[PDB]
Amino acid sequence: GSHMDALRYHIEWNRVAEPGTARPAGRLLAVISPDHAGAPWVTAVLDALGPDTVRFEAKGTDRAAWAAQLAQLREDEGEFHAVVSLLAAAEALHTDHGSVPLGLAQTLLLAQALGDAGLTAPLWCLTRGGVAAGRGDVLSSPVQGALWGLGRVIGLEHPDRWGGLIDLPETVDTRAAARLTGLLADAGGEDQLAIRGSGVLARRLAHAAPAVPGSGKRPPVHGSVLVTGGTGGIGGRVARRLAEQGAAHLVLTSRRGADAPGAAELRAELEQLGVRVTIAACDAADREALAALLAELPEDAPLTAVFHSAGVAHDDAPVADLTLGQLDALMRAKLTAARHLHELTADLDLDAFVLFSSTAAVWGSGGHPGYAAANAYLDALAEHRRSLGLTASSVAWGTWGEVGMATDPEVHDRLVRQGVLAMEPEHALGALDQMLENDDTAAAITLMDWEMFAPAFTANRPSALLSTVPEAVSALS
Amino acid sequence: GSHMDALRYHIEWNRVAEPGTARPAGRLLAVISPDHAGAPWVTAVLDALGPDTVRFEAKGTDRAAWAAQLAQLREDEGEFHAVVSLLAAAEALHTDHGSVPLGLAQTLLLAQALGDAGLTAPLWCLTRGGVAAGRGDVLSSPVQGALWGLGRVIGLEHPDRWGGLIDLPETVDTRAAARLTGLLADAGGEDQLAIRGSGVLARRLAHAAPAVPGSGKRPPVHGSVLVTGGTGGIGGRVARRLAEQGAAHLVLTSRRGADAPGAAELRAELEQLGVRVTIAACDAADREALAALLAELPEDAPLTAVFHSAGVAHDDAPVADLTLGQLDALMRAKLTAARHLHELTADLDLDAFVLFSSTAAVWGSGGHPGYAAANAYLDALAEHRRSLGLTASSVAWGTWGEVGMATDPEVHDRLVRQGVLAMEPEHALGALDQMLENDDTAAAITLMDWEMFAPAFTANRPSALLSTVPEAVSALS
Ligand SMILES: NC(=O)c1ccc[n+]([C@@H]2O[C@H](COP(=O)([O-])OP(=O)(O)OC[C@H]3O[C@@H](n4cnc5c(N)ncnc54)[C@H](OP(=O)(O)O)[C@@H]3O)[C@@H](O)[C@H]2O)c1
Ligand SMILES: NC(=O)c1ccc[n+]([C@@H]2O[C@H](COP(=O)([O-])OP(=O)(O)OC[C@H]3O[C@@H](n4cnc5c(N)ncnc54)[C@H](OP(=O)(O)O)[C@@H]3O)[C@@H](O)[C@H]2O)c1
Ligand SMILES: CCC(=O)[C@@H](C)C(=O)SCCNC(=O)CCNC(=O)[C@H](O)C(C)(C)CO
Ligand SMILES: CCC(=O)[C@@H](C)C(=O)SCCNC(=O)CCNC(=O)[C@H](O)C(C)(C)CO
Numbered sequence: 001g002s003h004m005d006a007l008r009y010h011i012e013w014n015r016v017a018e019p020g021t022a023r024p025a026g027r028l029l030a031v032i033s034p035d036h037a038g039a040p041w042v043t044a045v046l047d048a049l050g051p052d053t054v055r056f057e058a059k060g061t062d063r064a065a066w067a068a069q070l071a072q073l074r075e076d077e078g079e080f081h082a083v084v085s086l087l088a089a090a091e092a093l094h095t096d097h098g099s100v101p102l103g104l105a106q107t108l109l110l111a112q113a114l115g116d117a118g119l120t121a122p123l124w125c126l127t128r129g130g131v132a133a134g135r136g137d138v139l140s141s142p143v144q145g146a147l148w149g150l151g152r153v154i155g156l157e158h159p160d161r162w163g164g165l166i167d168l169p170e171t172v173d174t175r176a177a178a179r180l181t182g183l184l185a186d187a188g189g190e191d192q193l194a195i196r197g198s199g200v201l202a203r204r205l206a207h208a209a210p211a212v213p214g215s216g217k218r219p220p221v222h223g224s225v226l227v228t229g230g231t232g233g234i235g236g237r238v239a240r241r242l243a244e245q246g247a248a249h250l251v252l253t254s255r256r257g258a259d260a261p262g263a264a265e266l267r268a269e270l271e272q273l274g275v276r277v278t279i280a281a282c283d284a285a286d287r288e289a290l291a292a293l294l295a296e297l298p299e300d301a302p303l304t305a306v307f308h309s310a311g312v313a314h315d316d317a318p319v320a321d322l323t324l325g326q327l328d329a330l331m332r333a334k335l336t337a338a339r340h341l342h343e344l345t346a347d348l349d350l351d352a353f354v355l356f357s358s359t360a361a362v363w364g365s366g367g368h369p370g371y372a373a374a375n376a377y378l379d380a381l382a383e384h385r386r387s388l389g390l391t392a393s394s395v396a397w398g399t400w401g402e403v404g405m406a407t408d409p410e411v412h413d414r415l416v417r418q419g420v421l422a423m424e425p426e427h428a429l430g431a432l433d434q435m436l437e438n439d440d441t442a443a444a445i446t447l448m449d450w451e452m453f454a455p456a457f458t459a460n461r462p463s464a465l466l467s468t469v470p471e472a473v474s475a476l477s
Numbered sequence: 478g479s480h481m482d483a484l485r486y487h488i489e490w491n492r493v494a495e496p497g498t499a500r501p502a503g504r505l506l507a508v509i510s511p512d513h514a515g516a517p518w519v520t521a522v523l524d525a526l527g528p529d530t531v532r533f534e535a536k537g538t539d540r541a542a543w544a545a546q547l548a549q550l551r552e553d554e555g556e557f558h559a560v561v562s563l564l565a566a567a568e569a570l571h572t573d574h575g576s577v578p579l580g581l582a583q584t585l586l587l588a589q590a591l592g593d594a595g596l597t598a599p600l601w602c603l604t605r606g607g608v609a610a611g612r613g614d615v616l617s618s619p620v621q622g623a624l625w626g627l628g629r630v631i632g633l634e635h636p637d638r639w640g641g642l643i644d645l646p647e648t649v650d651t652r653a654a655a656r657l658t659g660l661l662a663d664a665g666g667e668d669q670l671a672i673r674g675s676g677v678l679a680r681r682l683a684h685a686a687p688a689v690p691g692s693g694k695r696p697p698v699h700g701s702v703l704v705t706g707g708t709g710g711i712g713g714r715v716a717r718r719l720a721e722q723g724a725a726h727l728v729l730t731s732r733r734g735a736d737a738p739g740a741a742e743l744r745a746e747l748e749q750l751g752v753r754v755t756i757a758a759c760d761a762a763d764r765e766a767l768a769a770l771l772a773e774l775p776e777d778a779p780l781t782a783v784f785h786s787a788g789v790a791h792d793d794a795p796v797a798d799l800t801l802g803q804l805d806a807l808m809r810a811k812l813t814a815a816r817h818l819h820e821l822t823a824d825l826d827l828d829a830f831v832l833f834s835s836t837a838a839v840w841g842s843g844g845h846p847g848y849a850a851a852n853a854y855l856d857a858l859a860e861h862r863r864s865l866g867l868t869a870s871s872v873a874w875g876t877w878g879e880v881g882m883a884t885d886p887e888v889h890d891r892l893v894r895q896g897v898l899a900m901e902p903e904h905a906l907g908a909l910d911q912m913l914e915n916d917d918t919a920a921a922i923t924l925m926d927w928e929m930f931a932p933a934f935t936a937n938r939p940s941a942l943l944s945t946v947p948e949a950v951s952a953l954s
Binding site: 002005006014015016017018199206207209210212213214215467469470471 | 479491492493494495665666686687688689690691692944945947948950951954
């Protein structure tokens with residue numbers, strides 16, 4: 001019980017002190033995506049930054065061209081107090097990389113090209129409705145939410161030229177503008193911020209409250225349950241659990257399907273438990289294949305839940321190196337697949353819609369920008385779905401033992417050294433069931449050694465995020 | 478800043494499980510105050526407990542007579558599943574002890590007489606509007622609120638025959654009744670509960686929100702400020718602070734007034750800071766003297782704030798021993814004085830109405846039932862005043878160093894050994910200002926060693942209260 005409780009953490013937002021009322025002394029550089037500069041919040045921000053602010057229009061996605069343009073600007077215009085990116089407004093998918101929002105691609109390349117050009121002014125990435133901050137906040141853009149995943153990794157990899165992330169309110173009035181320009185002047189060590197009418201909120205990680213025994217509001221598991229990546233490590237273990245809890249029919253998918261290693265043994269396992277088993281080969285980013293799968297479900301066993309476990313973590317790279325192709329391949333099973341899943345099942349009144357995220361999206365991991373972005377999309381999509389009145393849960397896993405991605409010893413060793421320890425599957429799954437019985441929207445489930453993790457995480461840069469974890473605070477004293 | 482944040486804690490109420498649907502197997506004993514059994518909620522509870530429930534009418538306040546009656550009842554009727562007290566409905570002040578609500582007197586004597594008689598069934602004390610539980614809840618009876626202070630100490634001193642405290646809703650309908658009889662059957666380890674229309678809530682302690690400059694909009698300190706107990710330890714330090722922050726005129730009161738030890742030095746201190754000082758000898762329970770003090774304030778310096786620091790903690794005693802006389806002397810400067818202060822200033826539109834409480838009222842302290850009751854009144858009165866649209870704050874201090882009650886070394890040693898550490902006055906006052914800047918209604922301000930405190934506090938009995946303090950959870954794991 002308390003073993004599972006100890007695994008569960010929650011992102012929350014605390015009010016922080018009002019900033020000062022002077023705009024920065026030095027000049028700002030504002031980066032705009034020229035075909036996506038029309039949104040009201042972009043206009044309001046440009047107006048708040050004032051006419052002295054230099055504007056750079058980021059056209060297309062050409063790293064070398066931008067580097068040369070930025071170098072010229074630095075030469076001509078001198079040094080900047082900060083760089084303020086409005087590239088998040090470009091939500092349309094990149095025409096050559098169908099799983100990458102244009103704004104996300106352009107933000108990556110901007111971070112690369114600023115380094116290339118030696119423009120060292122701290123980079124601030126602005127979004128509008130990419131987080132749910134404050135009671136009753138509406139996360140209106142899960143695409144912009146992905147950009148926070150990337151941003152946190154930029155802060156780990158380039159801490160000395162990263163400013164942070166600020167989410168703007170729906171209405172950027174004079175209060176909100178003064179709060180924005182104040183933070184850009186000095187942010188008081190905060191770097192993950194939401195501006196809202198009631199004040200300025202900052203992102204915090206906290207222990208979740210211990211499960212209240214006997215208090216579950218989870219519907220019984222029944223009918224058909226789709227587990228994407230269901231032939232993989234965590235997915236198989238999740239499929240078994242669901243079978244024990246009363247699913248009538250488990251639909252497992254993956255690109256390899258019945259050819260996936262271990263698939264024949266997993267099917268026989270599930271059939272011993274008295275469950276119908278369908279194992280289908282198909283890319284979760286393929287909308288038509290998903291539709292066809294849902295259309296052929298038994299009339300006796302309609303879809304009641306989705307567990308999205310499809311994902312890859314390999315072929316990622318440092319921010320300074322990551323290509324748009326590698327980014328696309330990392331986003332595919334996460335952004336594109338989850339969006340299909342959401343759209344195809346929105347009208348089905350599901351009991352559960354569970355997205356498997358990662359701690360790489362909670363606090364960030366160096367070397368894993370694309371994976372962090374892709375999983376940050378899932379967290380944001382769950383908040384978005386709740387605002388529409390749909391069920392959703394995003395579970396950001398730490399490291400599993402025994403099965404799945406993280407059982408390579410070299411990977412394992414790296415993680416244990418950072419203090420992200422391998423969970424026993426029974427404990428991880430038990431903590432998941434607690435989350436689902438509480439009907440939480442988003443949680444991290446992870447076994448930590450804070451005495452290892454906190455000093456490693458904050459070596460280069462303090463983290464206000466962790467100020468609300470007493471073990472982290474205590475490690476750093 | 479964050480050091481002062483770390484001193485501040487906040488009582489909150491979280492939803493817990495719906496209880497079961499079976500009435501207790503064994504028979505209940507219901508204790509009623511015969512002249513005060515008319516209230517609607519008392520009738521509704523008696524009806525919910527059903528006709529099999531044995532009734533005991535607690536007449537007067539005679540410990541020995543009740544002990545003999547209870548012994549007879551046990552003889553005749555057997556042992557009981559639990560004892561359900563409805564004595565809180567007696568809000569009228571005791572005829573012989575003008576600071577003691579009759580119900581509070583009778584609850585003490587009941588807890589004493591049950592022990593005397595060897596009735597071991599867990600004692601549950603019911604109240605109606607004695608806490609503010611849930612958003613927009615109205616604490617309508619601060620007198621009944623005092624009973625929760627006493628109750629928590631009964632739980633520390635007699636953990637094996639204490640059930641707990643349950644606050645009923647305004648309307649005890651069938652849902653509320655089934656919730657009550659379900660909790661009496663099995664409370665799932667909870668012992669501080671509120672039944673409301675939306676469900677069952679339980680009492681929780683959390684770290685308070687970090688300071689945000691000017692959020693509660695505290696007005697500037699100005700005009701005349703009354704500090705009762707102003708010649709005493711904390712009071713004098715509070716007077717000094719207010720003088721530094723621009724009070725025009727400090728009115729310090731105590732029973733000894735200008736004869737109080739150190740009073741001539743404190744006057745000179747405050748006057749060096751440019752403040753006018755009035756020191757009056759004045760029992761804060763004397764309504765007429767307080768009225769005369771308020772009537773003589775200059776029109777150029779009207780009353781703007783009250784800081785209620787009057788109080789005694791000595792000559793308390795264990796629950797088993799405490800007399801009504803001792804109880805009266807502890808309640809006097811708290812209940813009676815605060816009530817006068819509330820009534821005489823209700824129409825003055827104060828900027829601040831600040832009551833000095835104790836952690837003895839937050840979580841309880843063995844050997845200090847009378848003090849805990851008296852201070853729990855202050856917490857409840859602050860919530861009550863907020864429901865009326867009046868300003869109020871209750872500050873439940875831990876232990877001060879340097880000045881005041883707790884500076885005796887053997888007392889100090891006992892506290893340090895329980896993990897309640899002595900605060901530096903500047904840090905305690907800094908935390909108070911944070912609380913007043915946020916305009917919080919109730920907070921505890923205390924320096925804790927949770928690794929010492931949690932195991933000592935829960936040695937004999939678990940505490941759900943502390944499950945929401947991660948340092949407590951970690952100490953116990
Ligand atoms: N293991 C951990 O410690 C951990 C920590 C954080 C988060 N996670 C998340 O948990 C989930 C499960 O991870 P795991 O450890 O079970 O990894 P795994 O054993 O590699 O399983 C991943 C599954 O996703 C499938 N997949 C990959 N891309 C797909 C696509 N486009 N369409 C459909 N299926 C696809 C894979 O099969 P094919 O290759 O045959 O398609 C595989 O069955 C992942 O989303 C991962 O991001 C895991
Ligand atoms: N010190 C702590 O660590 C701590 C912890 C929790 C709570 N508190 C609370 O903080 C407040 C101040 O405590 P302290 O440590 O400053 O103790 P203190 O030095 O004894 O101050 C108490 C003051 O109250 C006065 N007083 C007592 N009964 C009174 C009455 N009936 N009418 C008017 N004045 C009366 C006393 O003076 P006379 O005797 O001359 O009346 C004295 O000036 C108290 O309410 C106490 O319960 C203190
Ligand atoms: C690679 C497989 C995978 O799922 C991984 C990326 C994840 O689940 S993330 C878990 C690994 N690490 C983290 O979550 C914490 C990263 N934190 C760290 O403390 C690193 O030392 C810093 C200093 C921040 C450099 O990145
Ligand atoms: C006596 C001066 C005074 O103000 C004191 C009573 C107060 O401020 S209350 C603070 C003293 N102690 C407490 O708050 C903690 C009580 N906690 C404890 O852990 C006790 O050891 C238990 C085991 C519960 C028995 O009472």
